[PDB]
From Swiss-Prot:
Entry's localization field: Zymogen granule membrane
Residues bearing the modification Phosphothreonine: T5
Ranges of the Annexin repeats in the UniProt entry: 12-83, 84-155, 167-239, 243-314
Name assigned to this protein: Annexin A4
Keywords: Acetylation, Annexin, Calcium, Calcium/phospholipid-binding, Cytoplasmic vesicle, Membrane, Phosphoprotein, Repeat
SMART domains: ANX
Chain positions with N6-acetyllysine modification: K211, K291, K298
C-alpha cells in the first residue's frame, strides 16, 4: 500500500542512457557509480528499452558488456536488475534445481509469494527456455508432502475471490485442530488442503478461528506438528496470506542477521521486490526488528554491491 522504491524515470532517454553506460565501461576499468546512477533509477521495463537502444546505437550487447566488466555480488545484482521480471524468476528456479543440490528455500519463496498468474507465466517461460517441465523438475527434486505443496502452488489452482463460507471456515479450523490432536502423527493432508486450496479471505478467517478454538496461533501449531521443508512451506503460505511484505522483511532479516550473509536470498529479494512493495517491506522490517532495513544492508555489505542494494532499498541519510 506504500508500494515500491524503484519507479519509472521521468525524462527517460534510452539513447543517452546507452551512451552513459558505454562511456562507463569503455577503456581500462569501469565507472561502477555511473552504472548504478542509470540502472538503479530506471524500472525493469525501461532497462529493457536501454538494452534495445544499446544494441541499436552502440552496436554492442549490454548484458555481455556488464558481465565482462563487473564481478561478484555486484555483477549478480546488476545482471539480475537487467533481466525481465518473469525470466529472473525462471532462472532462479532453474538455478535452485540444477545439478546435485536443491535450494528448497528459493522454491518456497517464489512459489508461495507469486500469484497464480505470475506462476503461469513462469511455468510457460521455464518450459520454453529449457525444454523441461517445471512440475516434472519439482517432482524429481522434492518428495512427499513438501512436494505436494510445491506442485499445488505451481499449478495455480487456489480458489480466488473473497467468498466467505463461514461454516467451511469453522469446519476447516476444527479439522486443523483435530489433525494436530491425532495420537500417532499429524494429519498433514488437512494442512495441505486448507492452506493450498482456500481463498485468502477464507484463510484469514480460518487463522482467527483456529486461534479462537485452540488458543494457539496457526504458526505455533505448524511448528510443533510438522517439520522440515513441509513445515517451512506451510509457514511461508501463512505469512504471505497475512502480509507478503512482512514475509519478505523476515527473509531479509534472516539473510543478514548473525555471521556472514545469504547473498543469494538478499539479492533475489531486493531485485524482485524493489518495484513492488519495498516501502512496505521497510515499514514491516522496522516494526518487527526495531532497526531500519537500510542500516542492516549498510552494515552487512560493502563496495558497489552495498551502493546498489541501498538504492534498491531507498533511504536514509
Ligand atoms: Ca572497461
Ligand atoms: Ca537438484
Ligand atoms: Ca551478517
Amino acid at each position: 500500500t506504500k508500494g515500491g522504491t524503484v519507479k519509472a524515470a521521468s525524462g527517460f532517454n534510452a539513447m543517452e542512457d546507452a551512451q552513459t553506460l558505454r562511456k562507463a565501461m569503455k577503456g581500462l576499468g569501469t565507472d561502477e557509480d555511473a552504472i548504478i546512477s542509470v540502472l538503479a533509477y530506471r524500472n525493469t521495463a525501461q532497462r529493457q528499452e536501454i538494452r534495445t537502444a544499446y544494441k541499436s546505437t552502440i552496436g554492442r550487447d549490454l548484458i555481455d558488456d556488464l558481465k565482462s566488466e563487473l564481478s561478484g555480488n555486484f555483477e549478480q545484482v546488476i545482471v539480475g536488475m537487467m533481466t525481465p521480471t518473469v525470466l529472473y524468476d525462471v532462472q532462479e528456479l532453474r538455478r535452485a534445481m540444477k545439478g546435485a543440490g536443491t535450494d528448497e528455500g528459493c522454491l518456497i519463496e517464489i512459489l508461495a509469494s507469486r500469484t497464480p498468474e505470475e506462476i503461469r507465466r513462469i511455468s510457460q517461460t521455464y518450459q520454453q527456455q529449457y525444454g523441461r517441465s517445471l512440475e516434472d523438475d519439482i517432482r524429481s527434486d522434492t518428495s512427499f508432502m513438501f512436494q505436494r505443496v510445491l506442485v499445488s502452488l505451481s499449478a495455480g489452482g487456489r480458489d480466488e475471490g473473497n467468498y466467505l463460507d463461514d461454516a467451511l471456515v469453522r469446519q476447516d479450523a476444527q479439522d486443523l485442530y483435530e489433525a494436530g490432536e491425532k495420537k500417532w502423527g499429524t494429519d498433514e493432508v488437512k494442512f495441505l488442503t486448507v492452506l493450498c486450496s482456500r481463498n485468502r479471505n477464507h484463510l484469514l478467517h480460518v487463522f482467527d478461528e483456529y486461534k479462537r478454538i485452540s488458543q494457539k496461533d496457526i504458526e505455533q501449531s505448524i511448528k510443533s506438528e510438522t517439520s522440515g521443508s513441509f513445515e517451512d512451506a506451510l509457514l511461508a503460505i501463512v505469512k504471505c496470506m497475512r502480509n507478503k511484505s512482512a514475509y519478505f522483511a523476515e527473509k531479509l532479516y534472516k539473510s543478514m542477521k548473525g555471521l556472514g550473509t545469504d547473498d543469494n536470498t538478499l539479492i533475489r529479494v531486493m531485485v524482485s521486490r524493489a518495484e513492488i512493495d519495498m516501502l512496505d517491506i521497510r515499514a514491516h522490517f522496522k516494526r518487527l526488528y526495531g532497526k531500519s532495513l537500510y542500516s542492516f544492508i549498510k552494515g552487512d555489505t560493502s563496495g558497489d554491491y552495498r551502493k546498489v542494494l541501498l538504492v534498491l532499498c531507498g533511504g536514509d541519510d
